[PDB]
Amino acid sequence: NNIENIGDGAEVVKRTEDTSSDKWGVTQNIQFDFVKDKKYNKDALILKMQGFINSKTTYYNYKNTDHIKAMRWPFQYNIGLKTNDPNVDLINYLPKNKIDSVNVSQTLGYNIGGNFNSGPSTGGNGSFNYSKTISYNQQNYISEVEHQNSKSVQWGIKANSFITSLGKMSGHDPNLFVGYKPYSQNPRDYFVPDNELPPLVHSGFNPSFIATVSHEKGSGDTSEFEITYGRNMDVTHATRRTTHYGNSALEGSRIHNAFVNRNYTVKYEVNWKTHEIKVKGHN
């Protein structure tokens, strides 16, 4: 339906899937680009994983106590791709290396014969028959590949370094996001305002990741892929201790990994012969 000629007898067959979950607060917008090149001895599929993961940050009374309030927030965003097809191999993924740049912008370039290049989106690596670019912001967060093998890749985009009213804080600091004194008994009012929170905490994350897989020609028409987007959430408790003597400022405590793997997983079936992509299921 949507095919691009990429020169020298090759073409790219493009398909996009877009699926949202109100339950998980996730949109997976996936681009599936089949590279049809007679000069490359395997079938190739480039996946560009975009969409949005809501932060799902919430505020509540800890055990409905009078003076302990809680903030549930995304310590890490999860992006993962996996297959169970023995005929498929993961051949590249971007970003490949740990990266803390506020903006991550990279390009995967393809040249006839199964040649792939990873480099800056600004170029300087050469001319390609086809290319795909990723771009995402991750202010105060850091991206890393948590694991990768021939069948899967998982990234974590985690809370890293913050500028607070008390100076620099790591993503593990128990006082992170805790206010000075409550403005009211509303649980929100024990934590700093939205302007003092990064977009990844107040709003969410706009992923932009690439993975390329190869498939043995003539080995089977279909493969299943599971793509997972989600969050691992931490809880910060802020406690107001009344004293006529010391510091009555709020004190923070952290429950690290309070609600892990809150993920939306979608199973996609890829047909290497027809180029039909279909959703097989989801949670």
PDB file of N, CA, C and O in Angstrom, residues 18-69:
ATOM      1  N   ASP A  18      -1.041   1.716  15.315  1.00  0.00           N
ATOM      2  CA  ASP A  18      -1.201   2.649  16.418  1.00  0.00           C
ATOM      3  C   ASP A  18      -2.275   2.061  17.331  1.00  0.00           C
ATOM      4  O   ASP A  18      -3.421   1.844  16.903  1.00  0.00           O
ATOM      5  N   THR A  19      -1.888   1.750  18.576  1.00  0.00           N
ATOM      6  CA  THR A  19      -2.791   1.132  19.564  1.00  0.00           C
ATOM      7  C   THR A  19      -2.601   1.833  20.886  1.00  0.00           C
ATOM      8  O   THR A  19      -1.456   2.016  21.315  1.00  0.00           O
ATOM      9  N   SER A  20      -3.714   2.223  21.536  1.00  0.00           N
ATOM     10  CA  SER A  20      -3.674   2.915  22.809  1.00  0.00           C
ATOM     11  C   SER A  20      -4.394   2.115  23.872  1.00  0.00           C
ATOM     12  O   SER A  20      -5.334   1.358  23.568  1.00  0.00           O
ATOM     13  N   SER A  21      -3.981   2.324  25.117  1.00  0.00           N
ATOM     14  CA  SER A  21      -4.568   1.707  26.296  1.00  0.00           C
ATOM     15  C   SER A  21      -4.884   2.766  27.314  1.00  0.00           C
ATOM     16  O   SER A  21      -3.972   3.438  27.833  1.00  0.00           O
ATOM     17  N   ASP A  22      -6.189   2.938  27.610  1.00  0.00           N
ATOM     18  CA  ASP A  22      -6.585   3.863  28.668  1.00  0.00           C
ATOM     19  C   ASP A  22      -6.161   3.321  30.016  1.00  0.00           C
ATOM     20  O   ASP A  22      -5.839   4.104  30.925  1.00  0.00           O
ATOM     21  N   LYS A  23      -6.202   1.979  30.165  1.00  0.00           N
ATOM     22  CA  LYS A  23      -5.828   1.324  31.410  1.00  0.00           C
ATOM     23  C   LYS A  23      -4.372   1.662  31.753  1.00  0.00           C
ATOM     24  O   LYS A  23      -4.066   2.090  32.882  1.00  0.00           O
ATOM     25  N   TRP A  24      -3.471   1.435  30.781  1.00  0.00           N
ATOM     26  CA  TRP A  24      -2.048   1.633  31.043  1.00  0.00           C
ATOM     27  C   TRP A  24      -1.556   3.053  30.844  1.00  0.00           C
ATOM     28  O   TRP A  24      -0.478   3.370  31.335  1.00  0.00           O
ATOM     29  N   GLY A  25      -2.334   3.881  30.151  1.00  0.00           N
ATOM     30  CA  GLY A  25      -1.928   5.247  29.811  1.00  0.00           C
ATOM     31  C   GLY A  25      -0.799   5.205  28.809  1.00  0.00           C
ATOM     32  O   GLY A  25       0.239   5.834  29.017  1.00  0.00           O
ATOM     33  N   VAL A  26      -0.956   4.388  27.756  1.00  0.00           N
ATOM     34  CA  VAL A  26       0.110   4.202  26.758  1.00  0.00           C
ATOM     35  C   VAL A  26      -0.458   4.239  25.348  1.00  0.00           C
ATOM     36  O   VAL A  26      -1.501   3.645  25.077  1.00  0.00           O
ATOM     37  N   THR A  27       0.299   4.847  24.432  1.00  0.00           N
ATOM     38  CA  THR A  27       0.048   4.728  23.017  1.00  0.00           C
ATOM     39  C   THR A  27       1.295   4.130  22.400  1.00  0.00           C
ATOM     40  O   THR A  27       2.365   4.701  22.545  1.00  0.00           O
ATOM     41  N   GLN A  28       1.162   3.000  21.693  1.00  0.00           N
ATOM     42  CA  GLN A  28       2.260   2.466  20.904  1.00  0.00           C
ATOM     43  C   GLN A  28       1.989   2.867  19.453  1.00  0.00           C
ATOM     44  O   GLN A  28       0.995   2.432  18.857  1.00  0.00           O
ATOM     45  N   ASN A  29       2.886   3.668  18.860  1.00  0.00           N
ATOM     46  CA  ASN A  29       2.769   4.033  17.440  1.00  0.00           C
ATOM     47  C   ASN A  29       4.034   3.443  16.853  1.00  0.00           C
ATOM     48  O   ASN A  29       5.149   3.928  17.134  1.00  0.00           O
ATOM     49  N   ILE A  30       3.874   2.358  16.090  1.00  0.00           N
ATOM     50  CA  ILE A  30       5.010   1.611  15.566  1.00  0.00           C
ATOM     51  C   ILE A  30       5.065   1.729  14.055  1.00  0.00           C
ATOM     52  O   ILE A  30       4.033   1.588  13.395  1.00  0.00           O
ATOM     53  N   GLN A  31       6.265   1.997  13.519  1.00  0.00           N
ATOM     54  CA  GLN A  31       6.476   1.989  12.078  1.00  0.00           C
ATOM     55  C   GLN A  31       7.198   0.688  11.767  1.00  0.00           C
ATOM     56  O   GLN A  31       8.211   0.360  12.416  1.00  0.00           O
ATOM     57  N   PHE A  32       6.666  -0.075  10.805  1.00  0.00           N
ATOM     58  CA  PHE A  32       7.267  -1.322  10.357  1.00  0.00           C
ATOM     59  C   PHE A  32       7.715  -1.102   8.941  1.00  0.00           C
ATOM     60  O   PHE A  32       6.883  -0.930   8.053  1.00  0.00           O
ATOM     61  N   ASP A  33       9.027  -1.045   8.712  1.00  0.00           N
ATOM     62  CA  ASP A  33       9.551  -0.821   7.372  1.00  0.00           C
ATOM     63  C   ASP A  33      10.316  -2.039   6.886  1.00  0.00           C
ATOM     64  O   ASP A  33      11.427  -2.284   7.328  1.00  0.00           O
ATOM     65  N   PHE A  34       9.727  -2.797   5.954  1.00  0.00           N
ATOM     66  CA  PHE A  34      10.379  -3.974   5.358  1.00  0.00           C
ATOM     67  C   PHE A  34      11.334  -3.501   4.298  1.00  0.00           C
ATOM     68  O   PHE A  34      10.930  -2.780   3.393  1.00  0.00           O
ATOM     69  N   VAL A  35      12.591  -3.932   4.378  1.00  0.00           N
ATOM     70  CA  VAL A  35      13.559  -3.579   3.345  1.00  0.00           C
ATOM     71  C   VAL A  35      13.593  -4.739   2.361  1.00  0.00           C
ATOM     72  O   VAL A  35      13.946  -5.861   2.741  1.00  0.00           O
ATOM     73  N   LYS A  36      13.145  -4.503   1.129  1.00  0.00           N
ATOM     74  CA  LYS A  36      13.109  -5.548   0.103  1.00  0.00           C
ATOM     75  C   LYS A  36      14.286  -5.280  -0.803  1.00  0.00           C
ATOM     76  O   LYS A  36      14.220  -4.398  -1.646  1.00  0.00           O
ATOM     77  N   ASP A  37      15.367  -6.016  -0.610  1.00  0.00           N
ATOM     78  CA  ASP A  37      16.588  -5.805  -1.368  1.00  0.00           C
ATOM     79  C   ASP A  37      17.118  -7.166  -1.800  1.00  0.00           C
ATOM     80  O   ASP A  37      17.579  -7.941  -0.959  1.00  0.00           O
ATOM     81  N   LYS A  38      17.071  -7.450  -3.116  1.00  0.00           N
ATOM     82  CA  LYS A  38      17.554  -8.723  -3.664  1.00  0.00           C
ATOM     83  C   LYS A  38      19.024  -8.968  -3.361  1.00  0.00           C
ATOM     84  O   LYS A  38      19.445 -10.125  -3.305  1.00  0.00           O
ATOM     85  N   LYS A  39      19.797  -7.884  -3.131  1.00  0.00           N
ATOM     86  CA  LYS A  39      21.230  -7.952  -2.863  1.00  0.00           C
ATOM     87  C   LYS A  39      21.580  -8.220  -1.396  1.00  0.00           C
ATOM     88  O   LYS A  39      22.753  -8.452  -1.075  1.00  0.00           O
ATOM     89  N   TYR A  40      20.573  -8.240  -0.513  1.00  0.00           N
ATOM     90  CA  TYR A  40      20.822  -8.599   0.885  1.00  0.00           C
ATOM     91  C   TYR A  40      20.257 -10.028   1.030  1.00  0.00           C
ATOM     92  O   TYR A  40      19.124 -10.280   0.648  1.00  0.00           O
ATOM     93  N   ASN A  41      21.067 -10.960   1.531  1.00  0.00           N
ATOM     94  CA  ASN A  41      20.657 -12.368   1.588  1.00  0.00           C
ATOM     95  C   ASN A  41      19.662 -12.748   2.704  1.00  0.00           C
ATOM     96  O   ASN A  41      19.280 -13.919   2.803  1.00  0.00           O
ATOM     97  N   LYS A  42      19.216 -11.775   3.498  1.00  0.00           N
ATOM     98  CA  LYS A  42      18.172 -11.986   4.496  1.00  0.00           C
ATOM     99  C   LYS A  42      17.084 -10.946   4.261  1.00  0.00           C
ATOM    100  O   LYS A  42      17.322  -9.933   3.594  1.00  0.00           O
ATOM    101  N   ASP A  43      15.894 -11.207   4.790  1.00  0.00           N
ATOM    102  CA  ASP A  43      14.806 -10.228   4.818  1.00  0.00           C
ATOM    103  C   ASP A  43      15.132  -9.315   5.990  1.00  0.00           C
ATOM    104  O   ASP A  43      15.791  -9.749   6.939  1.00  0.00           O
ATOM    105  N   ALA A  44      14.781  -8.049   5.898  1.00  0.00           N
ATOM    106  CA  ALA A  44      15.056  -7.145   7.013  1.00  0.00           C
ATOM    107  C   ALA A  44      13.826  -6.334   7.305  1.00  0.00           C
ATOM    108  O   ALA A  44      13.085  -5.978   6.385  1.00  0.00           O
ATOM    109  N   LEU A  45      13.626  -6.029   8.589  1.00  0.00           N
ATOM    110  CA  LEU A  45      12.519  -5.214   9.038  1.00  0.00           C
ATOM    111  C   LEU A  45      13.054  -4.186  10.000  1.00  0.00           C
ATOM    112  O   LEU A  45      13.643  -4.563  11.021  1.00  0.00           O
ATOM    113  N   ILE A  46      12.860  -2.900   9.694  1.00  0.00           N
ATOM    114  CA  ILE A  46      13.259  -1.841  10.620  1.00  0.00           C
ATOM    115  C   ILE A  46      12.023  -1.454  11.379  1.00  0.00           C
ATOM    116  O   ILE A  46      11.015  -1.129  10.756  1.00  0.00           O
ATOM    117  N   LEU A  47      12.097  -1.404  12.719  1.00  0.00           N
ATOM    118  CA  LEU A  47      10.972  -0.975  13.561  1.00  0.00           C
ATOM    119  C   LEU A  47      11.308   0.333  14.226  1.00  0.00           C
ATOM    120  O   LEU A  47      12.402   0.496  14.782  1.00  0.00           O
ATOM    121  N   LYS A  48      10.415   1.311  14.103  1.00  0.00           N
ATOM    122  CA  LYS A  48      10.603   2.575  14.784  1.00  0.00           C
ATOM    123  C   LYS A  48       9.472   2.671  15.778  1.00  0.00           C
ATOM    124  O   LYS A  48       8.299   2.704  15.403  1.00  0.00           O
ATOM    125  N   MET A  49       9.828   2.653  17.045  1.00  0.00           N
ATOM    126  CA  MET A  49       8.876   2.609  18.139  1.00  0.00           C
ATOM    127  C   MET A  49       8.709   3.985  18.743  1.00  0.00           C
ATOM    128  O   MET A  49       9.626   4.510  19.367  1.00  0.00           O
ATOM    129  N   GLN A  50       7.517   4.559  18.551  1.00  0.00           N
ATOM    130  CA  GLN A  50       7.174   5.892  19.043  1.00  0.00           C
ATOM    131  C   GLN A  50       5.841   5.818  19.795  1.00  0.00           C
ATOM    132  O   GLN A  50       5.385   4.723  20.109  1.00  0.00           O
ATOM    133  N   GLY A  51       5.224   6.957  20.069  1.00  0.00           N
ATOM    134  CA  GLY A  51       3.981   6.965  20.814  1.00  0.00           C
ATOM    135  C   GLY A  51       4.187   7.768  22.083  1.00  0.00           C
ATOM    136  O   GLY A  51       4.904   8.765  22.085  1.00  0.00           O
ATOM    137  N   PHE A  52       3.508   7.377  23.151  1.00  0.00           N
ATOM    138  CA  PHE A  52       3.582   8.146  24.378  1.00  0.00           C
ATOM    139  C   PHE A  52       3.293   7.241  25.568  1.00  0.00           C
ATOM    140  O   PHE A  52       2.462   6.328  25.481  1.00  0.00           O
ATOM    141  N   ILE A  53       3.986   7.479  26.677  1.00  0.00           N
ATOM    142  CA  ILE A  53       3.716   6.771  27.912  1.00  0.00           C
ATOM    143  C   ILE A  53       3.398   7.852  28.949  1.00  0.00           C
ATOM    144  O   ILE A  53       4.280   8.644  29.291  1.00  0.00           O
ATOM    145  N   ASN A  54       2.155   7.895  29.442  1.00  0.00           N
ATOM    146  CA  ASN A  54       1.781   8.887  30.450  1.00  0.00           C
ATOM    147  C   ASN A  54       2.646   8.643  31.703  1.00  0.00           C
ATOM    148  O   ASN A  54       3.008   7.503  31.997  1.00  0.00           O
ATOM    149  N   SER A  55       3.004   9.707  32.424  1.00  0.00           N
ATOM    150  CA  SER A  55       3.771   9.480  33.656  1.00  0.00           C
ATOM    151  C   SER A  55       2.942   8.728  34.689  1.00  0.00           C
ATOM    152  O   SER A  55       3.510   7.978  35.489  1.00  0.00           O
ATOM    153  N   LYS A  56       1.598   8.934  34.697  1.00  0.00           N
ATOM    154  CA  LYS A  56       0.710   8.336  35.696  1.00  0.00           C
ATOM    155  C   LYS A  56       1.083   8.801  37.125  1.00  0.00           C
ATOM    156  O   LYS A  56       0.779   8.120  38.105  1.00  0.00           O
ATOM    157  N   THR A  57       1.742   9.980  37.246  1.00  0.00           N
ATOM    158  CA  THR A  57       2.124  10.470  38.560  1.00  0.00           C
ATOM    159  C   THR A  57       0.855  10.825  39.341  1.00  0.00           C
ATOM    160  O   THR A  57      -0.030  11.508  38.811  1.00  0.00           O
ATOM    161  N   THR A  58       0.784  10.366  40.586  1.00  0.00           N
ATOM    162  CA  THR A  58      -0.392  10.610  41.420  1.00  0.00           C
ATOM    163  C   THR A  58       0.036  10.953  42.816  1.00  0.00           C
ATOM    164  O   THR A  58       1.175  10.706  43.213  1.00  0.00           O
ATOM    165  N   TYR A  59      -0.910  11.520  43.567  1.00  0.00           N
ATOM    166  CA  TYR A  59      -0.692  11.982  44.917  1.00  0.00           C
ATOM    167  C   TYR A  59      -1.813  11.468  45.762  1.00  0.00           C
ATOM    168  O   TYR A  59      -2.989  11.614  45.401  1.00  0.00           O
ATOM    169  N   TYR A  60      -1.468  10.966  46.941  1.00  0.00           N
ATOM    170  CA  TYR A  60      -2.513  10.406  47.808  1.00  0.00           C
ATOM    171  C   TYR A  60      -2.112  10.429  49.272  1.00  0.00           C
ATOM    172  O   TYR A  60      -0.961  10.683  49.604  1.00  0.00           O
ATOM    173  N   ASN A  61      -3.090  10.221  50.160  1.00  0.00           N
ATOM    174  CA  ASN A  61      -2.791  10.190  51.582  1.00  0.00           C
ATOM    175  C   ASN A  61      -2.213   8.806  51.886  1.00  0.00           C
ATOM    176  O   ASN A  61      -2.838   7.802  51.533  1.00  0.00           O
ATOM    177  N   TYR A  62      -1.002   8.733  52.472  1.00  0.00           N
ATOM    178  CA  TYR A  62      -0.392   7.431  52.755  1.00  0.00           C
ATOM    179  C   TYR A  62      -1.204   6.770  53.870  1.00  0.00           C
ATOM    180  O   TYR A  62      -1.311   7.320  54.957  1.00  0.00           O
ATOM    181  N   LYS A  63      -1.869   5.638  53.557  1.00  0.00           N
ATOM    182  CA  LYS A  63      -2.754   4.919  54.505  1.00  0.00           C
ATOM    183  C   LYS A  63      -3.819   5.809  55.156  1.00  0.00           C
ATOM    184  O   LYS A  63      -4.232   5.561  56.292  1.00  0.00           O
ATOM    185  N   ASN A  64      -4.262   6.867  54.437  1.00  0.00           N
ATOM    186  CA  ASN A  64      -5.218   7.875  54.878  1.00  0.00           C
ATOM    187  C   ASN A  64      -4.836   8.485  56.235  1.00  0.00           C
ATOM    188  O   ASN A  64      -5.714   8.881  57.017  1.00  0.00           O
ATOM    189  N   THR A  65      -3.501   8.606  56.488  1.00  0.00           N
ATOM    190  CA  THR A  65      -3.008   9.212  57.738  1.00  0.00           C
ATOM    191  C   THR A  65      -3.262  10.712  57.688  1.00  0.00           C
ATOM    192  O   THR A  65      -3.567  11.267  56.623  1.00  0.00           O
ATOM    193  N   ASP A  66      -3.094  11.376  58.822  1.00  0.00           N
ATOM    194  CA  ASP A  66      -3.303  12.809  58.868  1.00  0.00           C
ATOM    195  C   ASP A  66      -2.153  13.568  58.235  1.00  0.00           C
ATOM    196  O   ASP A  66      -2.374  14.610  57.622  1.00  0.00           O
ATOM    197  N   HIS A  67      -0.926  13.085  58.430  1.00  0.00           N
ATOM    198  CA  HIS A  67       0.243  13.878  58.072  1.00  0.00           C
ATOM    199  C   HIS A  67       1.244  13.290  57.142  1.00  0.00           C
ATOM    200  O   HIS A  67       2.301  13.893  56.961  1.00  0.00           O
ATOM    201  N   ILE A  68       0.959  12.122  56.557  1.00  0.00           N
ATOM    202  CA  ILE A  68       1.914  11.534  55.621  1.00  0.00           C
ATOM    203  C   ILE A  68       1.253  11.516  54.251  1.00  0.00           C
ATOM    204  O   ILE A  68       0.168  10.920  54.075  1.00  0.00           O
ATOM    205  N   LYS A  69       1.893  12.172  53.292  1.00  0.00           N
ATOM    206  CA  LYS A  69       1.364  12.186  51.936  1.00  0.00           C
ATOM    207  C   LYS A  69       2.320  11.476  51.028  1.00  0.00           C
ATOM    208  O   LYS A  69       3.518  11.325  51.353  1.00  0.00           O
TER     209      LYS A  69
END
